[model samples]
Target chain A: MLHEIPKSEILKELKRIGAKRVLIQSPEGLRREAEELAGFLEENNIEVFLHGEINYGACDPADREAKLVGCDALIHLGHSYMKLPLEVPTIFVPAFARVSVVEALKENIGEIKKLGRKIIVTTTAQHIHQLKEAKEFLESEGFEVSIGRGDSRISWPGQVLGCNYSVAKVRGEGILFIGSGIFHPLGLAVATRKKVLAIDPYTKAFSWIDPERFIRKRWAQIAKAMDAKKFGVIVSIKKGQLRLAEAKRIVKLLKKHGREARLIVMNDVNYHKLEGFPFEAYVVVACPRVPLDDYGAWRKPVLTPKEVEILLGLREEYEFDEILGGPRESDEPFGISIHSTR
Target chain B: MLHEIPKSEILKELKRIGAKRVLIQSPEGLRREAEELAGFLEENNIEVFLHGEINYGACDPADREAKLVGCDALIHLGHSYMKLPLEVPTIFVPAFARVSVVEALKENIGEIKKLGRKIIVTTTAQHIHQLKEAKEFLESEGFEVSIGRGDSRISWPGQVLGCNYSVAKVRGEGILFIGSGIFHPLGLAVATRKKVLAIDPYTKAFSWIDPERFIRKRWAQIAKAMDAKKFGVIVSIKKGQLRLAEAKRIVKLLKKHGREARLIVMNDVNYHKLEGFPFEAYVVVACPRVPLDGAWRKPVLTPKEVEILLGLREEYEFDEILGGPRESDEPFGISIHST
Candidate 1:
């Protein structure tokens, strides 16, 4: 599924804003398209400074970098906007993938039906616009669809980020993820504790989320970390990824267990980045991937906040970690399905 | 020479200050020493977090990074401290190199004699402590030695940096650069417009700075840049390498020459870093190394060279922004201390 960039709208937006100097950013997958668009803006009398460094989703915006370089605005592509305070004006023009969600869902309908009659539809920003269309197609095929409206993390309903999976925690028995990868599908399953049917629109293949064994691996990591006394809590300070409150709470939790803990704040949490610190084990409060996926990279034990809770014998079951706070849509004036303020 | 780290002083200082968590930084050349030192500090009870990323000199301190990581203090090595407003309390403990200036100068006595009887002795921070010893050695040999004490940029007497040569330019006829490599010595020659006798204290070798051939080569580079219609003004985001105001002025100046220019800010200036731009050439407003050391692939010029290419100036001026603002017939620098 190729993500189509809105070139004309970008040009017209820059023109109307009278942007002289601008910064353009995109994920590595859309680097070539970003360059072409940058050239178009340059030819149209606008100077562009493209970010050639690492970029991931809309989590870490270079608004500060743009402001430091005296850029008028930032043109961010590929991901939808997160509600973080930006230093400079940012144009959150996402890359809309030109793929048929209905067609892909139709092919995987048989596999999806095996899960349940009513399934929750969830996807990332790349296919978020077509979640309703996917729901319509699934409903027409004699299956009820429920799309979750999530918290501060998700920009739109049914849109699930790697760090946010609340959009999939709705009124449904099983989950149907419409995206490219196993990252979100697996996340949805682990988060909601539901059976997930994943359909890759590009490959036209169907897959299931295997959270049963994954939870066992997490427990194994937690068991290994129980022997460690000193812990370094890895906290990311990037815009959307910042979890200071969570990191402090995790640090406090570790302290209560009579373990030495330090709040290690960093931009990115890699094994190389944390090599200088002296810690027997680490707890990452940044992203789910840091604990569930990249735990092998760090030679010592690395656990998430939830994993740490399980280590202290606090929780018996796995609860997906989230940077959830603030006034949420779910907390907003709902008594029943049709109701009054709580 | 292997720059030795002061292990006991570091431990004693951290213990005395009651530093629980600290950030450490060193140039890539001294990374091994920094790692060994970090391990020692961690073993002694203080939590050490060494910066494993890019570090150029004391010029680019990680005070901001240190503050962000909740570090109590930053221990900077390899270069002496410049007086810049730091985000966090920094301990500017520089690494002292184990080398003799007398032995190196003795080997290059013939070359020193060829320069002049009156010569100014200057070296970088590594060999700065041995300047008085070198001066005494030369004075005993019946040669008058003059060591220059530079402006705010330099840390000690006779100390010179890549971007600071005012220490040597203060006195004497010819220059005797007591350091390794041709970087500082050649820069000394260009900055002072004097004959330079370079002695590599580590290698025990001798070399002379030839501004004649250098100026001729620079003129050719500037001439090549004249044909480039589009230019990128490269500015660095590193602590000491920042010249935002100057970069803006250069962009303005390039546009006056009717050249398509863009102000590109980055950490390191290389051919690959500039690969994303549609610029045919570039004018670096950061360090002199970008224009002089790496001028291949696409034509690149220093800020002064760009002015020369545009017929604004004729003579070749080696780009050296010595941090602070010194309004002379030289480069326009934004106030470094306040900035």
Candidate 2:
């Protein structure tokens, strides 16, 4: 059922690395394929250990679990290049979807052109392979189309993660995201402050990304969190999202503003588990999308690092800098060194 | 509402320590008192931080959380001393149950005397205060009774933990446990291989703790795990149960036996979570009760240190003194001690 993962290529890489015992990880949607893949790998004389947990993205890789079990290599399915630092050799297999975008793009070409501007085309890993065809079809209808050059956190040219929009940051007044969810287009609209449109290639439904209510909701949260005297800076222990140094810096910034801050370390930042904390507000230093996407799930105001900076008067402008755009000359990169050795 | 703990003694300890910022912790049953206790401490001018998590027993103290929040001390409610090592000053406020044992023992004395031997009286921390009075009443009725001196894990003399039964290992043929449940009495029977009689202080009901079927069930698990080639040695990341140093040693020991072993770290030793591992067997270095109580919940055999040492029906004598004796015993206790 896992059609787009290029299993032969992954097998060749595993053979080249001499990985006899390998740990396989996959997201919930691709677990059955991972089980079948494990069986196939074992048939090829490579001992496989299947990671049986919920992996949301490449950010939630089981590198620690792999190392603890003494696996020689790690094979993560259904994610782009997360720039994960690992002691063992790791391979990320992007599972592109089998659906086509040409039919959907043709059906929505007139409506998309009615916007009267050139649009940048982008999508998630599943629909990434069809972006070229989508751009060709959209351009033939007299719509000036361009695909984004993705950053380090993405492998395909026009891909977008929930927490990263660098691939969608292009010279266009509008964005045509050929994907299935409102998550990407909504984040694109909020990040770029431009008109974003989502066309589902699977269902061919269309919608414009209007972040007005989401922005107003965020402003209300910011206002509510400003009155908090005690803050909890949550540091995630996920392999790709360990931000202890960033959490400590936020705590110092909170202390400078006369607000007390405590560090809460968690493996998976669960809402039920965190509901017991006495803090009035929390600044999640782990994934940027956690506070952005799941803020309303909890009772307290959960802020991003940038939101916390704005609340502390450290920054004047309110900007959602998702994933930090992957090491620009002007921006000092956060997180561990991409090439760091353990 | 807060009637069990002596609040004056708790206040006196806080004053003696000169604790400015205190953190209060309690189990689920005692959270209301912990909440009221927090308000009372704040009223007394001592700043309080109430730990709002499930603290299972004294074994699950919030020392790590207390240190993370920069508390001056931790005041734990409703649990006896766990002999927990702490960097900050800590006080244990045991919430002694107010129930009397005279009427319950009198109602069940005839059944308890049917054992035809002297009986050892033991109860949990909440009922340890009534053990003395219960023993006196039992002696006055021509029944000889004795209380046991506890092990290191238990604070009071007659107190027994769900995991530790050394306090009940006395020179009596039958154990007259003055507790409310069948869990402790059943564990006492399994550990000591003796007959146990339980008298509920609240209900005045009597029951016998027979562990023959449970022991037979464990023997079946031990036999199945003997054929396992790979093992996952689980070490808990919780404050009191971090056994990394010990898990490494177990890995080495398994390597000596020509078996592959890996260390799996977890906050809570869950059966559903550990069942996903590829290993055929698991050696839990965390709480001893997890393997003892929850082993049948999973497909693989979850073994304690003693079960691992027996090495699959080796005809070795079963020793309940595992993890007992403040001093080190053998390589099996390597996870419980290094220093």
Candidate 3:
């Protein structure tokens, strides 16, 4: 079974926009549900087009495909809101699951009290609705709780994305992340150097994400990349992950560090495609988790922009939250001026 | 190394067109040569953009990428001249190899005498220059020979593409194919149904290409797809291979044959992507060689339009020569209705 989207609200918004033709976009995991939703919309007299390209996250909305197919509105599913605007009217369906978290929290209460007294709780978009109930359960169990209001990219409070963790704003102690797997809580553990406990409400399984192993691996990668002279700053062409401005800044920084760098723009940041370049080190600016997730698969050192900053001695310590939700320096608009040389 | 392109003529054409920025397009095999060619153009005060997308054949020209990069001219390498036109002035560099074929043909004279006396000679675009030498050697041995003037898609008289075999037109006892290995000679064997003898000029190796085994395998594939109730008509979104109108007609024909059909348009005919669809059989309308080469990897039958015709046409002979039929209906000029 899948999460139930608010169909009437989506239909009302579509009617309000006078949308006759609509495009539905979803991540690979939610494509089955998206097709079902598209079928329902098509039966209601709205022409539907399902965009089949791989969607990485909320940052990658299918605005170009929608506009190419002459779509009037787009309904993006299974992700939170993004900071960017679409060419057409779009709706972000935060399709959160209604799972009971009492059992999982009650089972992990003994381990939760052992970590710290002051705990900041956060969760992903799918389990965001269960955070209030989780906070209430933690407070009744003699634990102090604080939920930070998330930034503009998130729809609700205490919600955390893979890259953005602005909702986990408490600067100290344990962070109880009510999410499914290791990707979010592992990021949370590194973003806030605290003891992060991840609990899955669906499976009632809990684990503590140790950030030390990942921290040591990244430190070794940064040290390895420091010996390289040439760097290729990777910029993705995907709609959500296109960071041309950030890539340009990284190129300038690499030159200032007395190293040669060039822009390698591509749709998918594949390992094989990066191997064709002659650069010794690569700074992947597309998905921040790509370096964290697939570092061992690459032949050369594929570092994040923050990891490059650490390698260049610009930053003393590595913090992922700075790369995630916070405002970046020299955040300029892209694709405005045509015929600009690379 | 690779076949050397005529740099003098290419430079002359670039100067004639007044090209400041140019796009270099080539197949995957000639991409290394294309990069070296681009370096030379860059030295000649020409801004070069190498089109890195997959080039299927000469029909798939890079006019879109050339126009997107605002290029004044394009130099397409390693393929014969296409009948299509581009938005910008373009030059086709037929990088044909001038190879010695007399020694290889002398070694295989016994096998050549066993095939037939009167033969039609053909080769690929790379060895089109050596076809005359091959014909003269066979004629000196008191054997009759005839070379065909190729179709609109090919450049020279005796050249043959994988899909188009108009150059092997003579219905003879044999086709003396003076080229490399199995792809061209096998297509010629199936397309002409003549005893095809292939001679590799570089390796001095020879082999007889048999078409019966492939024809029987295709017969089994057509039989296997006969049980299918649903069909997917695959249309390529390539610049030249797009056959949306042909795909629509195939869908209509499939429906008339009491089967469900839908159009699946794609850039690459990846087998894994087609596996996701629920169709039992897929009729590829893209490059015709894809089904001949890659049908084994697919879970369902990857048939051609001619294969579908064999399954549906009440009385038909399984003739591979006739399979590469005459000009199709509604032969619209591809890649020309530009924006």
Candidate with more favorable, higher TM-score: 1 or 3 = 1
lDDT of all predictions:
0.74, 0.70, 0.69
Quote each prediction's TM-score. Answer: 0.78, 0.67, 0.74
Error of 2 at B334 (Å): 22
lDDT of residue A106 for candidate 1? 73
Each model's TM-score for chain A is 0.90, 0.89, 0.88
lDDT of 2 at A119: 78
Per residue, candidate 1 scores C-alpha lDDT tens digits across B88-107 of 66776665666777888787
- For model 1, the DockQ equals 0.18
Per-candidate fnat, comma-separated? 0.03, 0.00, 0.00
Q: Show the colliding residue pairs in model 2.
A: none
- Which 10 successive residues of model 1 chain B have the least lDDT summed? B329-338
Per-candidate DockQ vs. reference: 0.18, 0.12, 0.14
Query: Candidate 2's C-alpha lDDT?
Result: 0.70
Candidate 2, A159-201: lDDT as tens digits: 7888888877778878888887677788888888888888898
For A1-342, candidate 3 gives per-residue lDDT tens digits of 235666666777788778998877766567567656765776687766555454567677766556644678777777666556567777776666777888888987888887688889888777766777888888898889988776655556787777778878765478888868788899887887778888888887889898888889889989889889977777665556767678778887988989977555455676764444457888888788788888368889888888888888999987772334443222111111001011
Against the true structure, whose DockQ is highest?
1
Ranking by DockQ: 1, 3, 2
